[PDB]
């Protein structure tokens, strides 16, 4: 399973990943900095900088991980999305289970 979210700064993204690793809820994380977001505020269109985070874990850990992210995220309504892959290298699934 893959979980995705965004934060305003690179520092905040690293802090979320470290907390999830210390609790043994995920196996690893990838961070993508310096993107642009476009949306509407007060009937006006504006743009700003954001950072993306991607997290890799096992299917049976998903409800626990989503609950913890909601508690520590800096935005008032955090976007959190879950994607289920159709296939994967079996040796890699073994490593993910070994790490969590």
């Amino acid at each position: 399973a893959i979980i995705e979210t965004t934060t305003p700064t690179e520092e905040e993204a690293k802090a979320i990943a470290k907390k999830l690793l210390e609790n043994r809820l995920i196996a690893e994380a990838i961070i993508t900095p310096a993107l642009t977001k476009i949306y509407r505020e007060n009937g006006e269109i504006k743009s700003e900088t954001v950072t993306r985070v991607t997290l890799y874990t096992e299917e049976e850990n998903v409800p626990k991980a989503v609950t913890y992210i909601k508690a520590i995220h800096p935005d008032p309504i955090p976007p959190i999305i879950v994607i289920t892959p159709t296939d994967a290298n079996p040796a890699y699934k073994g490593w993910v289970a070994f790490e969590t």
Partner: protein, 188 residues
Amino acid sequence: DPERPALGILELSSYARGVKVADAALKAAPVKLLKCEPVEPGRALIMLLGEPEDVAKAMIAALDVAGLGSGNLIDYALIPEIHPQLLPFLKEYKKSEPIKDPNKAIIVAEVSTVAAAIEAADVALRLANVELTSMRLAEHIGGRASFTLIGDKEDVEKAARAIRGVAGERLLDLEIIEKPVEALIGNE
């Protein structure tokens, strides 16, 4: 608790399993217990209050015990900062005040779980210019819950879109009443 606490919710199908789940949660972190009551028919409802990260640690321990996957867990949610208007309706029983304006409309919603009801109302109060007047949870009912909001006509229209988004398949009914008669306020 500070001015702004967090809230966790768990719904289970057995009173005995509920007692076990609540014991594990209270041992994991310093939170305060609000509800541990049996729910019609033979179910149970647990509510926890405290600091955001403390509530998260408690819910993690509870999800392990509850058997998430065995069919004993009906629904759950976590709300990081509960809206100020909602807290009075949860600590005690409240009533409907006289409605000052006669030009406001109302909206009435019915959902299938307690978790859906609290989360949907919290988001609607956050995004739209409306007010909360009543909230009724399941008491001998069987899981159904409902709540009522009041505001101007176009504001109530926006709140309806948000409620449908949050509830999803858990929504049972939703109605909008323009210019309601007086007796509906008093009977409420």
